Protein backbone atom coordinates (compact mmCIF):
# COMPACT_ATOMS: atom_id res chain seq x y z
CA UNK A 1 0.00 0.00 0.00
CA UNK A 2 1.09 3.60 0.59
CA UNK A 3 1.15 6.61 -1.68
CA UNK A 4 3.26 9.76 -1.63
CA UNK A 5 1.75 13.12 -2.34
CA UNK A 6 3.51 16.40 -2.99
CA UNK A 7 1.47 19.59 -2.55
CA UNK A 8 3.05 22.61 -4.32
CA UNK A 9 1.43 25.52 -2.56
CA UNK A 10 1.45 29.13 -3.67
CA UNK A 11 -0.17 31.60 -1.29
CA UNK A 12 1.33 34.28 0.94
CA UNK A 13 -1.15 33.99 3.82
CA UNK A 14 -1.54 30.89 6.05
CA UNK A 15 -5.04 32.08 7.12
CA UNK A 16 -6.20 32.39 3.51
CA UNK A 17 -8.82 30.21 1.88
CA UNK A 18 -5.95 28.64 -0.13
CA UNK A 19 -4.14 27.98 3.11
CA UNK A 20 -7.25 26.22 4.43
CA UNK A 21 -7.50 24.09 1.31
CA UNK A 22 -3.84 23.17 1.64
CA UNK A 23 -4.25 22.31 5.34
CA UNK A 24 -7.36 20.18 4.70
CA UNK A 25 -5.48 18.24 2.04
CA UNK A 26 -2.55 17.63 4.39
CA UNK A 27 -4.96 16.55 7.18
CA UNK A 28 -7.05 14.18 5.09
CA UNK A 29 -4.19 12.62 3.13
CA UNK A 30 -2.21 12.25 6.39
CA UNK A 31 -5.25 10.60 8.07
CA UNK A 32 -5.40 8.11 5.19
CA UNK A 33 -1.83 7.04 5.93
CA UNK A 34 -0.32 8.77 2.90
CA UNK A 35 3.21 10.21 2.88
CA UNK A 36 2.78 13.98 2.45
CA UNK A 37 5.23 16.74 1.60
CA UNK A 38 4.38 20.42 1.04
CA UNK A 39 6.50 22.88 -0.94
CA UNK A 40 5.29 26.24 0.45
CA UNK A 41 6.80 28.44 -2.25
CA UNK A 42 6.41 31.82 -0.63
CA UNK A 43 7.75 30.60 2.75
CA UNK A 44 10.73 29.11 0.87
CA UNK A 45 11.13 32.42 -1.03
CA UNK A 46 11.37 30.12 -4.06
CA UNK A 47 13.35 31.58 -6.94
CA UNK A 48 11.09 31.99 -10.04
CA UNK A 49 13.64 33.31 -12.52
CA UNK A 50 15.30 31.03 -15.05
CA UNK A 51 18.92 32.21 -14.95
CA UNK A 52 22.46 30.90 -15.30
CA UNK A 53 22.63 30.62 -11.52
CA UNK A 54 20.53 27.46 -11.94
CA UNK A 55 23.68 25.71 -13.16
CA UNK A 56 26.60 25.11 -10.78
CA UNK A 57 30.14 24.88 -12.08
CA UNK A 58 30.79 25.79 -15.70
CA UNK A 59 28.33 26.22 -18.58
CA UNK A 60 28.47 24.03 -21.67
CA UNK A 61 28.51 27.22 -23.75
CA UNK A 62 29.41 30.35 -21.74
CA UNK A 63 29.51 32.45 -24.94
CA UNK A 64 25.80 32.22 -25.74
CA UNK A 65 23.50 31.25 -22.84
CA UNK A 66 20.59 28.93 -23.77
CA UNK A 67 18.58 28.08 -20.64
CA UNK A 68 16.96 24.93 -22.02
CA UNK A 69 20.20 23.40 -23.27
CA UNK A 70 22.22 24.38 -20.19
CA UNK A 71 19.69 22.95 -17.77
CA UNK A 72 19.32 19.80 -19.85
CA UNK A 73 23.09 19.24 -19.70
CA UNK A 74 23.22 20.24 -16.03
CA UNK A 75 20.52 17.71 -15.20
CA UNK A 76 22.45 14.93 -16.94
CA UNK A 77 25.68 16.06 -15.28
CA UNK A 78 24.00 16.45 -11.89
CA UNK A 79 25.01 20.14 -11.88
CA UNK A 80 21.69 21.91 -11.16
CA UNK A 81 21.15 24.33 -8.28
CA UNK A 82 20.09 22.56 -5.09
CA UNK A 83 16.69 24.29 -4.83
CA UNK A 84 15.81 22.79 -8.20
CA UNK A 85 17.09 19.30 -7.40
CA UNK A 86 15.43 19.33 -3.97
CA UNK A 87 12.12 19.83 -5.82
CA UNK A 88 12.86 17.17 -8.43
CA UNK A 89 13.48 14.65 -5.65
CA UNK A 90 10.03 15.41 -4.16
CA UNK A 91 8.41 15.11 -7.60
CA UNK A 92 10.34 11.92 -8.49
CA UNK A 93 9.09 10.20 -5.34
CA UNK A 94 5.52 11.51 -5.54
CA UNK A 95 2.60 9.43 -6.83
CA UNK A 96 0.36 12.50 -6.88
CA UNK A 97 1.23 16.21 -7.18
CA UNK A 98 -1.41 18.72 -6.11
CA UNK A 99 -0.92 22.39 -7.04
CA UNK A 100 -2.82 24.71 -4.66
CA UNK A 101 -3.01 28.31 -5.83
CA UNK A 102 -5.19 31.38 -6.50
CA UNK A 103 -5.70 32.09 -10.21
CA UNK A 104 -3.46 35.03 -11.27
CA UNK A 105 -4.26 36.32 -14.77
CA UNK A 106 -5.94 33.06 -15.89
CA UNK A 107 -2.85 31.16 -14.77
CA UNK A 108 -0.53 30.36 -11.85
CA UNK A 109 1.09 33.07 -9.70
CA UNK A 110 4.60 33.82 -11.01
CA UNK A 111 6.32 32.08 -8.09
CA UNK A 112 4.60 28.82 -9.11
CA UNK A 113 5.19 29.49 -12.85
CA UNK A 114 8.85 29.73 -11.85
CA UNK A 115 8.68 26.34 -10.09
CA UNK A 116 7.32 24.83 -13.34
CA UNK A 117 9.92 26.63 -15.48
CA UNK A 118 12.91 25.59 -13.34
CA UNK A 119 11.93 22.21 -11.88
CA UNK A 120 10.42 20.52 -14.96
CA UNK A 121 13.57 20.58 -17.06
CA UNK A 122 14.43 18.54 -20.11
CA UNK A 123 15.78 15.15 -19.05
CA UNK A 124 13.82 15.20 -15.83
CA UNK A 125 10.23 15.88 -16.90
CA UNK A 126 10.36 15.33 -20.65
CA UNK A 127 12.61 14.71 -23.61
CA UNK A 128 12.61 13.41 -27.17
CA UNK A 129 10.63 11.12 -27.38
CA UNK A 130 9.24 11.33 -23.86
CA UNK A 131 6.37 13.82 -23.92
CA UNK A 132 2.60 13.88 -23.56
CA UNK A 133 1.53 10.23 -23.17
CA UNK A 134 5.20 9.19 -22.99
CA UNK A 135 6.31 12.09 -20.80
CA UNK A 136 9.02 11.18 -18.30
CA UNK A 137 6.70 11.61 -15.30
CA UNK A 138 4.20 9.06 -16.62
CA UNK A 139 2.59 6.94 -13.94
CA UNK A 140 2.12 9.99 -11.72
CA UNK A 141 -1.13 11.85 -11.09
CA UNK A 142 -1.45 15.66 -11.05
CA UNK A 143 -4.31 17.90 -10.00
CA UNK A 144 -4.86 21.66 -10.04
CA UNK A 145 -6.75 22.99 -6.99
CA UNK A 146 -7.52 26.57 -8.00
CA UNK A 147 -9.39 29.41 -6.33
CA UNK A 148 -10.76 32.29 -8.43
CA UNK A 149 -11.85 35.86 -8.00
CA UNK A 150 -14.53 35.53 -10.71
CA UNK A 151 -17.82 33.66 -10.14
CA UNK A 152 -18.71 30.34 -11.74
CA UNK A 153 -21.20 32.07 -14.02
CA UNK A 154 -18.43 34.36 -15.33
CA UNK A 155 -16.48 31.25 -16.31
CA UNK A 156 -19.14 29.92 -18.68
CA UNK A 157 -19.04 29.83 -22.49
CA UNK A 158 -21.10 33.01 -22.69
CA UNK A 159 -19.73 34.57 -19.51
CA UNK A 160 -17.11 37.33 -19.80
CA UNK A 161 -14.14 35.14 -18.87
CA UNK A 162 -15.20 32.24 -21.05
CA UNK A 163 -15.13 28.57 -20.03
CA UNK A 164 -12.68 27.53 -17.27
CA UNK A 165 -11.38 24.76 -19.48
CA UNK A 166 -10.04 27.53 -21.73
CA UNK A 167 -7.46 28.80 -19.24
CA UNK A 168 -6.75 25.24 -18.06
CA UNK A 169 -5.26 24.21 -21.43
CA UNK A 170 -1.75 25.64 -20.93
CA UNK A 171 -1.51 24.15 -17.42
CA UNK A 172 -3.25 20.79 -17.79
CA UNK A 173 -2.29 19.95 -21.36
CA UNK A 174 0.68 22.17 -22.15
CA UNK A 175 2.46 21.42 -18.89
CA UNK A 176 1.14 18.45 -16.89
CA UNK A 177 0.13 16.14 -19.76
CA UNK A 178 3.23 17.20 -21.65
CA UNK A 179 5.38 15.82 -18.81
CA UNK A 180 3.48 12.53 -18.85
CA UNK A 181 1.16 13.24 -15.89
CA UNK A 182 -2.28 11.63 -15.81
CA UNK A 183 -4.43 14.67 -14.98
CA UNK A 184 -7.22 14.46 -12.43
CA UNK A 185 -10.20 16.77 -12.81
CA UNK A 186 -9.42 20.25 -11.47
CA UNK A 187 -10.83 21.39 -8.16
CA UNK A 188 -12.10 24.93 -8.70
CA UNK A 189 -13.29 26.91 -5.71
CA UNK A 190 -15.08 29.86 -7.30
CA UNK A 191 -14.89 33.29 -5.69
CA UNK A 192 -14.37 32.40 -2.01
CA UNK A 193 -13.91 36.08 -1.12
CA UNK A 194 -17.53 36.75 -2.11
CA UNK A 195 -19.10 33.58 -0.66
CA UNK A 196 -20.59 33.32 2.83
CA UNK A 197 -19.02 31.44 5.74
CA UNK A 198 -21.32 28.50 5.01
CA UNK A 199 -20.54 28.37 1.29
CA UNK A 200 -16.88 28.71 2.21
CA UNK A 201 -17.05 25.89 4.76
CA UNK A 202 -18.89 23.99 2.05
CA UNK A 203 -16.20 24.32 -0.62
CA UNK A 204 -13.58 23.20 1.89
CA UNK A 205 -15.68 20.17 2.86
CA UNK A 206 -16.22 19.22 -0.79
CA UNK A 207 -12.44 19.21 -1.22
CA UNK A 208 -11.89 17.18 1.96
CA UNK A 209 -14.66 14.85 0.79
CA UNK A 210 -13.20 14.46 -2.69
CA UNK A 211 -9.76 13.66 -1.23
CA UNK A 212 -11.29 10.66 0.51
CA UNK A 213 -11.66 8.82 -2.81
CA UNK A 214 -8.93 10.59 -4.79
CA UNK A 215 -7.17 7.28 -5.48
CA UNK A 216 -10.37 5.84 -7.00
CA UNK A 217 -10.63 8.61 -9.60
CA UNK A 218 -10.04 8.17 -13.31
CA UNK A 219 -7.80 10.74 -15.08
CA UNK A 220 -9.52 13.16 -17.47
CA UNK A 221 -8.98 12.66 -21.21
CA UNK A 222 -6.54 15.55 -21.63
CA UNK A 223 -7.48 16.53 -25.16
CA UNK A 224 -8.34 19.68 -27.07
CA UNK A 225 -11.84 18.23 -27.25
CA UNK A 226 -12.11 17.97 -23.46
CA UNK A 227 -10.95 21.58 -23.04
CA UNK A 228 -12.74 23.12 -26.03
CA UNK A 229 -15.24 20.67 -27.54
CA UNK A 230 -18.93 20.34 -26.67
CA UNK B 1 6.51 58.71 -35.04
CA UNK B 2 4.38 60.66 -32.59
CA UNK B 3 3.99 57.45 -30.61
CA UNK B 4 5.49 55.93 -27.49
CA UNK B 5 6.33 52.25 -27.40
CA UNK B 6 7.28 50.08 -24.41
CA UNK B 7 8.89 46.74 -25.11
CA UNK B 8 8.76 44.34 -22.12
CA UNK B 9 11.57 41.89 -22.91
CA UNK B 10 12.20 38.55 -21.25
CA UNK B 11 15.31 36.70 -22.40
CA UNK B 12 18.60 36.13 -20.57
CA UNK B 13 20.87 36.32 -23.60
CA UNK B 14 21.49 39.48 -25.68
CA UNK B 15 22.71 37.28 -28.58
CA UNK B 16 19.54 35.16 -28.73
CA UNK B 17 16.90 35.17 -31.43
CA UNK B 18 14.62 36.97 -28.94
CA UNK B 19 17.37 39.52 -28.46
CA UNK B 20 17.52 40.08 -32.23
CA UNK B 21 13.71 40.50 -32.45
CA UNK B 22 13.83 43.01 -29.59
CA UNK B 23 16.74 44.86 -31.24
CA UNK B 24 15.10 45.08 -34.66
CA UNK B 25 11.96 46.41 -32.98
CA UNK B 26 13.97 49.15 -31.28
CA UNK B 27 15.82 49.94 -34.54
CA UNK B 28 12.72 50.07 -36.73
CA UNK B 29 10.48 52.04 -34.34
CA UNK B 30 13.36 54.40 -33.56
CA UNK B 31 13.92 54.96 -37.31
CA UNK B 32 10.24 55.83 -37.64
CA UNK B 33 10.78 58.54 -35.06
CA UNK B 34 8.84 56.79 -32.27
CA UNK B 35 9.83 57.11 -28.61
CA UNK B 36 11.02 53.72 -27.37
CA UNK B 37 11.63 52.23 -23.95
CA UNK B 38 12.72 48.66 -23.15
CA UNK B 39 12.15 46.93 -19.82
CA UNK B 40 14.82 44.17 -19.96
CA UNK B 41 13.48 42.08 -17.09
CA UNK B 42 16.44 39.74 -16.51
CA UNK B 43 18.96 42.58 -16.77
CA UNK B 44 16.88 44.49 -14.22
CA UNK B 45 16.69 41.31 -12.04
CA UNK B 46 12.96 42.14 -11.95
CA UNK B 47 11.18 40.76 -8.85
CA UNK B 48 8.49 38.26 -9.95
CA UNK B 49 7.00 37.42 -6.56
CA UNK B 50 3.82 39.05 -5.31
CA UNK B 51 4.62 39.63 -1.64
CA UNK B 52 3.90 42.02 1.20
CA UNK B 53 7.17 43.80 0.35
CA UNK B 54 5.26 45.34 -2.56
CA UNK B 55 3.44 47.65 -0.13
CA UNK B 56 5.48 50.07 1.99
CA UNK B 57 2.71 51.67 4.04
CA UNK B 58 0.37 50.47 6.79
CA UNK B 59 -1.60 47.46 5.57
CA UNK B 60 -5.38 47.80 5.47
CA UNK B 61 -5.70 44.40 7.15
CA UNK B 62 -2.42 43.37 8.77
CA UNK B 63 -4.08 40.27 10.29
CA UNK B 64 -4.90 38.52 7.01
CA UNK B 65 -2.76 39.51 4.02
CA UNK B 66 -4.67 39.72 0.72
CA UNK B 67 -2.29 40.83 -2.07
CA UNK B 68 -5.03 42.10 -4.40
CA UNK B 69 -6.71 44.19 -1.70
CA UNK B 70 -3.43 45.50 -0.27
CA UNK B 71 -1.99 46.48 -3.65
CA UNK B 72 -5.27 48.10 -4.77
CA UNK B 73 -5.19 50.27 -1.62
CA UNK B 74 -1.45 50.92 -1.89
CA UNK B 75 -1.93 52.06 -5.48
CA UNK B 76 -4.54 54.63 -4.44
CA UNK B 77 -2.37 55.74 -1.52
CA UNK B 78 0.88 55.71 -3.51
CA UNK B 79 2.57 53.26 -1.19
CA UNK B 80 3.50 50.63 -3.79
CA UNK B 81 7.14 49.55 -4.13
CA UNK B 82 9.01 51.78 -6.56
CA UNK B 83 9.90 49.04 -9.06
CA UNK B 84 6.19 48.55 -9.66
CA UNK B 85 5.51 52.27 -10.01
CA UNK B 86 8.45 52.67 -12.43
CA UNK B 87 6.81 50.10 -14.73
CA UNK B 88 3.37 51.64 -14.37
CA UNK B 89 4.79 54.99 -15.50
CA UNK B 90 6.20 53.34 -18.65
CA UNK B 91 2.87 51.64 -19.44
CA UNK B 92 0.82 54.78 -18.70
CA UNK B 93 2.79 56.80 -21.26
CA UNK B 94 2.98 54.09 -23.91
CA UNK B 95 0.65 53.96 -26.90
CA UNK B 96 1.84 50.44 -27.73
CA UNK B 97 3.27 47.76 -25.46
CA UNK B 98 5.13 44.90 -27.10
CA UNK B 99 5.97 41.76 -25.10
CA UNK B 100 9.02 39.92 -26.49
CA UNK B 101 9.56 36.48 -25.06
CA UNK B 102 10.20 32.77 -25.62
CA UNK B 103 7.21 30.56 -24.86
CA UNK B 104 7.74 28.76 -21.51
CA UNK B 105 5.14 26.07 -20.82
CA UNK B 106 2.63 27.54 -23.29
CA UNK B 107 2.90 30.89 -21.50
CA UNK B 108 5.29 33.69 -20.52
CA UNK B 109 8.54 33.04 -18.55
CA UNK B 110 7.94 33.49 -14.79
CA UNK B 111 9.84 36.76 -14.68
CA UNK B 112 7.38 38.22 -17.19
CA UNK B 113 4.41 36.58 -15.44
CA UNK B 114 5.61 38.44 -12.33
CA UNK B 115 5.57 41.71 -14.25
CA UNK B 116 1.94 41.05 -15.20
CA UNK B 117 1.01 40.04 -11.65
CA UNK B 118 2.69 43.00 -9.96
CA UNK B 119 2.41 45.85 -12.44
CA UNK B 120 -1.19 45.38 -13.65
CA UNK B 121 -2.79 46.04 -10.28
CA UNK B 122 -6.36 47.03 -9.47
CA UNK B 123 -6.79 50.80 -9.67
CA UNK B 124 -4.15 51.07 -12.37
CA UNK B 125 -4.89 48.48 -15.05
CA UNK B 126 -8.50 47.68 -14.20
CA UNK B 127 -11.14 48.21 -11.57
CA UNK B 128 -14.23 46.31 -10.48
CA UNK B 129 -16.19 47.45 -12.44
CA UNK B 130 -13.92 48.68 -15.22
CA UNK B 131 -12.48 45.75 -17.14
CA UNK B 132 -12.47 44.15 -20.59
CA UNK B 133 -13.81 46.84 -22.93
CA UNK B 134 -13.99 49.16 -19.91
CA UNK B 135 -10.45 48.35 -18.75
CA UNK B 136 -8.31 51.22 -17.52
CA UNK B 137 -5.68 50.86 -20.25
CA UNK B 138 -8.30 51.34 -22.98
CA UNK B 139 -6.94 53.20 -25.99
CA UNK B 140 -3.57 51.44 -25.72
CA UNK B 141 -2.40 48.71 -28.10
CA UNK B 142 -0.64 45.52 -27.00
CA UNK B 143 1.13 42.84 -29.05
CA UNK B 144 2.76 39.50 -28.12
CA UNK B 145 5.92 38.65 -30.11
CA UNK B 146 6.55 35.06 -29.12
CA UNK B 147 9.12 32.47 -30.16
CA UNK B 148 8.59 28.73 -29.79
CA UNK B 149 10.54 25.50 -29.62
CA UNK B 150 7.85 23.63 -31.56
CA UNK B 151 7.24 24.09 -35.29
CA UNK B 152 4.15 25.68 -36.83
CA UNK B 153 2.82 22.24 -37.79
CA UNK B 154 2.92 21.12 -34.15
CA UNK B 155 0.88 24.20 -33.32
CA UNK B 156 -2.24 23.36 -35.31
CA UNK B 157 -5.66 21.89 -34.52
CA UNK B 158 -4.32 18.47 -35.56
CA UNK B 159 -0.80 18.98 -34.22
CA UNK B 160 0.50 17.61 -30.92
CA UNK B 161 0.35 21.07 -29.30
CA UNK B 162 -3.00 22.21 -30.69
CA UNK B 163 -3.53 25.53 -32.44
CA UNK B 164 -1.20 28.30 -31.29
CA UNK B 165 -4.23 30.50 -30.63
CA UNK B 166 -5.31 28.20 -27.80
CA UNK B 167 -2.37 29.15 -25.59
CA UNK B 168 -2.80 32.85 -26.35
CA UNK B 169 -6.16 33.04 -24.55
CA UNK B 170 -5.02 33.69 -20.95
CA UNK B 171 -2.54 36.31 -22.17
CA UNK B 172 -4.48 38.09 -24.90
CA UNK B 173 -7.97 37.86 -23.38
CA UNK B 174 -7.59 37.11 -19.70
CA UNK B 175 -4.86 39.70 -19.24
CA UNK B 176 -4.48 42.29 -21.99
CA UNK B 177 -8.12 42.58 -23.16
CA UNK B 178 -9.15 42.39 -19.48
CA UNK B 179 -7.10 45.55 -18.82
CA UNK B 180 -8.65 47.32 -21.79
CA UNK B 181 -5.85 46.94 -24.35
CA UNK B 182 -6.35 47.78 -29.02
CA UNK B 183 -4.75 43.47 -28.97
CA UNK B 184 -2.83 43.44 -32.24
CA UNK B 185 -2.22 40.12 -33.96
CA UNK B 186 0.57 38.09 -32.35
CA UNK B 187 3.96 37.75 -34.00
CA UNK B 188 4.90 34.10 -33.65
CA UNK B 189 8.38 33.09 -34.72
CA UNK B 190 8.27 29.31 -34.89
CA UNK B 191 11.16 27.10 -33.83
CA UNK B 192 14.12 29.40 -34.57
CA UNK B 193 16.51 26.91 -32.94
CA UNK B 194 15.87 24.23 -35.57
CA UNK B 195 15.49 26.72 -38.43
CA UNK B 196 18.27 27.41 -40.93
CA UNK B 197 20.06 30.76 -41.10
CA UNK B 198 18.01 31.68 -44.15
CA UNK B 199 14.82 30.99 -42.21
CA UNK B 200 15.92 32.91 -39.13
CA UNK B 201 16.97 35.99 -41.09
CA UNK B 202 13.63 35.63 -42.80
CA UNK B 203 11.67 35.63 -39.55
CA UNK B 204 13.58 38.68 -38.33
CA UNK B 205 13.00 40.60 -41.57
CA UNK B 206 9.31 39.63 -41.51
CA UNK B 207 8.98 41.21 -38.04
CA UNK B 208 10.94 44.32 -39.06
CA UNK B 209 8.82 44.59 -42.18
CA UNK B 210 5.62 44.24 -40.18
CA UNK B 211 6.67 47.02 -37.79
CA UNK B 212 6.97 49.38 -40.74
CA UNK B 213 3.17 49.50 -40.93
CA UNK B 214 2.21 48.54 -37.38
CA UNK B 215 0.29 51.79 -36.83
CA UNK B 216 -2.03 51.03 -39.74
CA UNK B 217 -3.09 47.67 -38.27
CA UNK B 218 -6.48 46.98 -36.72
CA UNK B 219 -6.68 44.92 -33.52
CA UNK B 220 -7.90 41.31 -33.61
CA UNK B 221 -11.40 40.58 -32.39
CA UNK B 222 -10.27 39.24 -28.96
CA UNK B 223 -13.06 36.72 -28.49
CA UNK B 224 -13.55 33.02 -27.83
CA UNK B 225 -14.38 32.49 -31.51
CA UNK B 226 -11.14 34.07 -32.73
CA UNK B 227 -9.19 31.90 -30.29
CA UNK B 228 -11.07 28.62 -30.47
CA UNK B 229 -13.25 28.92 -33.56
CA UNK B 230 -16.33 26.84 -34.30
C1 LIG C 1 -2.15 39.49 -9.32
C2 LIG C 1 -3.57 38.93 -9.25
C3 LIG C 1 -4.17 38.49 -10.43
C4 LIG C 1 -5.47 37.84 -10.43
N5 LIG C 1 -6.03 37.38 -11.65
C6 LIG C 1 -7.25 36.63 -11.57
C7 LIG C 1 -7.75 35.96 -12.73
O8 LIG C 1 -7.10 35.77 -13.76
N9 LIG C 1 -9.07 35.51 -12.65
C10 LIG C 1 -9.83 35.48 -11.45
O11 LIG C 1 -10.98 34.98 -11.50
N12 LIG C 1 -9.28 35.99 -10.30
C13 LIG C 1 -8.01 36.55 -10.36
N14 LIG C 1 -7.48 37.06 -9.17
C15 LIG C 1 -8.26 36.89 -7.93
C16 LIG C 1 -7.76 35.68 -7.12
O17 LIG C 1 -7.79 34.53 -7.98
C18 LIG C 1 -8.61 35.54 -5.86
O19 LIG C 1 -8.40 36.74 -5.11
C20 LIG C 1 -8.17 34.32 -5.00
O21 LIG C 1 -8.35 33.13 -5.76
C22 LIG C 1 -8.96 34.21 -3.70
O23 LIG C 1 -8.40 33.12 -2.90
P24 LIG C 1 -7.70 33.43 -1.48
O25 LIG C 1 -7.20 32.17 -0.90
O26 LIG C 1 -6.70 34.52 -1.67
O27 LIG C 1 -8.88 34.03 -0.58
P28 LIG C 1 -8.99 34.66 0.88
O29 LIG C 1 -9.28 36.13 0.81
O30 LIG C 1 -7.76 34.22 1.62
O31 LIG C 1 -10.26 33.97 1.50
C32 LIG C 1 -11.61 34.25 1.15
C33 LIG C 1 -12.37 34.28 2.48
O34 LIG C 1 -12.35 32.93 3.02
C35 LIG C 1 -12.05 33.00 4.41
N36 LIG C 1 -11.57 31.67 4.81
C37 LIG C 1 -10.28 31.20 4.91
N38 LIG C 1 -10.20 29.92 5.26
C39 LIG C 1 -11.53 29.55 5.45
C40 LIG C 1 -12.14 28.30 5.87
N41 LIG C 1 -11.42 27.21 6.14
N42 LIG C 1 -13.50 28.27 6.00
C43 LIG C 1 -14.21 29.41 5.74
N44 LIG C 1 -13.76 30.59 5.28
C45 LIG C 1 -12.36 30.59 5.19
C46 LIG C 1 -11.06 34.16 4.50
O47 LIG C 1 -10.71 34.56 5.81
C48 LIG C 1 -11.74 35.18 3.58
O49 LIG C 1 -12.68 36.02 4.24
C50 LIG C 1 -6.18 37.71 -9.17
C51 LIG C 1 -5.58 38.21 -8.00
C52 LIG C 1 -4.28 38.84 -8.02
C53 LIG C 1 -3.73 39.37 -6.70
C1 LIG D 1 11.58 26.43 -19.13
C2 LIG D 1 11.27 26.32 -20.63
C3 LIG D 1 9.97 26.03 -21.01
C4 LIG D 1 9.60 25.95 -22.42
N5 LIG D 1 8.29 25.60 -22.77
C6 LIG D 1 7.94 25.64 -24.17
C7 LIG D 1 6.59 25.43 -24.56
O8 LIG D 1 5.64 25.39 -23.77
N9 LIG D 1 6.37 25.27 -25.94
C10 LIG D 1 7.35 25.51 -26.93
O11 LIG D 1 7.02 25.42 -28.15
N12 LIG D 1 8.63 25.82 -26.54
C13 LIG D 1 8.92 25.87 -25.19
N14 LIG D 1 10.25 26.13 -24.83
C15 LIG D 1 11.23 26.41 -25.91
C16 LIG D 1 11.46 27.91 -26.12
O17 LIG D 1 10.18 28.54 -26.34
C18 LIG D 1 12.45 28.13 -27.27
O19 LIG D 1 13.68 27.53 -26.90
C20 LIG D 1 12.66 29.63 -27.57
O21 LIG D 1 11.44 30.14 -28.08
C22 LIG D 1 13.76 29.87 -28.60
O23 LIG D 1 14.07 31.30 -28.64
P24 LIG D 1 15.56 31.82 -28.34
O25 LIG D 1 15.59 33.26 -28.53
O26 LIG D 1 15.97 31.29 -27.00
O27 LIG D 1 16.46 31.07 -29.46
P28 LIG D 1 18.02 30.81 -29.72
O29 LIG D 1 18.53 29.75 -28.79
O30 LIG D 1 18.68 32.14 -29.73
O31 LIG D 1 18.05 30.12 -31.14
C32 LIG D 1 17.79 30.80 -32.36
C33 LIG D 1 19.04 30.69 -33.21
O34 LIG D 1 19.04 31.87 -34.01
C35 LIG D 1 20.30 32.52 -33.94
N36 LIG D 1 20.01 33.94 -34.11
C37 LIG D 1 19.90 34.92 -33.16
N38 LIG D 1 19.67 36.12 -33.66
C39 LIG D 1 19.70 35.91 -35.04
C40 LIG D 1 19.64 36.81 -36.16
N41 LIG D 1 19.60 38.14 -36.00
N42 LIG D 1 19.64 36.28 -37.42
C43 LIG D 1 19.73 34.92 -37.56
N44 LIG D 1 19.75 33.99 -36.58
C45 LIG D 1 19.80 34.59 -35.31
C46 LIG D 1 20.91 32.10 -32.60
O47 LIG D 1 22.30 32.33 -32.50
C48 LIG D 1 20.41 30.67 -32.46
O49 LIG D 1 21.33 29.71 -32.96
C50 LIG D 1 10.62 26.19 -23.43
C51 LIG D 1 11.94 26.42 -23.01
C52 LIG D 1 12.28 26.53 -21.62
C53 LIG D 1 13.72 26.86 -21.29
C1 LIG E 1 13.91 22.97 -23.04
O2 LIG E 1 12.76 23.27 -22.27
C3 LIG E 1 11.48 22.97 -22.80
C4 LIG E 1 10.46 22.81 -21.80
C5 LIG E 1 9.13 22.55 -22.13
C6 LIG E 1 8.81 22.43 -23.50
N7 LIG E 1 7.62 22.18 -24.14
C8 LIG E 1 7.85 22.17 -25.49
C9 LIG E 1 9.15 22.41 -25.77
C10 LIG E 1 9.85 22.50 -27.08
C11 LIG E 1 9.58 21.40 -28.05
N12 LIG E 1 10.62 21.38 -29.06
C13 LIG E 1 10.69 20.49 -30.06
C14 LIG E 1 11.52 20.89 -31.24
O15 LIG E 1 10.10 19.41 -30.01
C16 LIG E 1 9.80 22.58 -24.51
C17 LIG E 1 11.16 22.86 -24.15
C1 LIG F 1 -9.79 38.10 -14.85
O2 LIG F 1 -8.73 39.00 -14.56
C3 LIG F 1 -8.52 39.46 -13.23
C4 LIG F 1 -7.27 40.10 -13.03
C5 LIG F 1 -6.87 40.62 -11.81
C6 LIG F 1 -7.78 40.49 -10.72
N7 LIG F 1 -7.68 40.89 -9.42
C8 LIG F 1 -8.84 40.53 -8.76
C9 LIG F 1 -9.68 39.91 -9.61
C10 LIG F 1 -11.04 39.36 -9.31
C11 LIG F 1 -12.14 40.39 -9.43
N12 LIG F 1 -13.13 39.97 -10.40
C13 LIG F 1 -12.86 39.47 -11.61
C14 LIG F 1 -12.99 40.37 -12.77
O15 LIG F 1 -12.45 38.30 -11.74
C16 LIG F 1 -9.03 39.87 -10.88
C17 LIG F 1 -9.41 39.34 -12.17
ZN1 LIG G 1 -3.65 16.83 -22.69
ZN1 LIG H 1 -10.54 39.17 -25.57
Could A50 and B109 be called an inter-chain contact, meaning their C-beta atoms sit closer than 8 Å?
A: yes
Tell me which CATH homologous superfamily contains domain B1-230. Answer: Flavodoxin domain (3.40.50.360)
- Within 8 A of B64 by CB-CB distance, chain A residues are 13, 15-16
Q: Tell which one of B117, B120, B178, B222 to mutate to probe ligand 4, the residue whose CB is within 8 A of the most ligand atoms.
A: B178
Cα separation, A56 vs A79, in Å, equals 5
Element (H, E) at B208: helix B197-212
**CB pairs below 8 Å between A and B: how many?**
154
- Within 8 A of B157 by CB-CB distance, chain A residues are 224
Cα separation, A221 vs A187, in Å, equals 16
Gap from CA of B190 to ligand 2 centroid (Å): 9
Q: Nearest-CA residue of chain B relative to A157? A: B224
A 182-211 residues inside an 8 A Cβ radius of B: 193
> Nearest Cα to A160, choosing from B131, B220, B185?
B131
| Torsion sign, CA atoms A10, B104, A66, B22 | negative
DSSP string of B168-188, one letter each residue:
HHHHIIIIIITTT---PPPEE
B18 is in an annotated binding site: yes
A122-to-A52, A70, A149, B6, B146 alpha-carbon distances in Å? 16, 10, 34, 33, 20
In terms of C-beta distances under 8 Å and separation of at least 24 residues, what long-range contacts does A83-91 make, across chains too? A83/A44, A83/A46, A83/A47, A83/A118, A84/A54, A84/A118, A84/A119, A84/A121, A87/A39, A87/A115, A87/A118, A87/A119, A88/A119, A88/A124, A90/A6, A90/A37, A90/A39, A91/A6, A91/A119, A91/A125, A91/A137, A91/A140
Q: How was this entry determined?
A: X-ray
Q: What is the resolution of this structure in A?
A: 1.8
Cα separation, A224 vs A204, in Å, equals 30
A207 is in an annotated binding site: no
Query: Helices marked H in B49-152 — which ranges?
Result: 67-77, 82-93, 110-119
B51 is in an annotated binding site: no
Nearest CB to A12: which of B51, B116, B224?
B51
Cβ–ligand 1 distance for A104 under 6 Å, the answer: yes
Q: How far is B33 from chain A (nearest CA, A)?
A: 32
Could A48 and B105 be called an inter-chain contact, meaning their C-beta atoms sit closer than 8 Å?
A: no
Amino acid sequence: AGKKVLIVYAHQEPKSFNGSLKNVAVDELSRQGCTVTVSDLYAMNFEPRATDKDITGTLSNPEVFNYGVETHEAYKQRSLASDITDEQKKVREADLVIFQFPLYWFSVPAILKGWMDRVLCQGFAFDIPGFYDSGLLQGKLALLSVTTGGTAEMYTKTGVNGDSRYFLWPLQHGTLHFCGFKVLAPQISFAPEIASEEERKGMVAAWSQRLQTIWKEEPIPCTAHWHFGQ
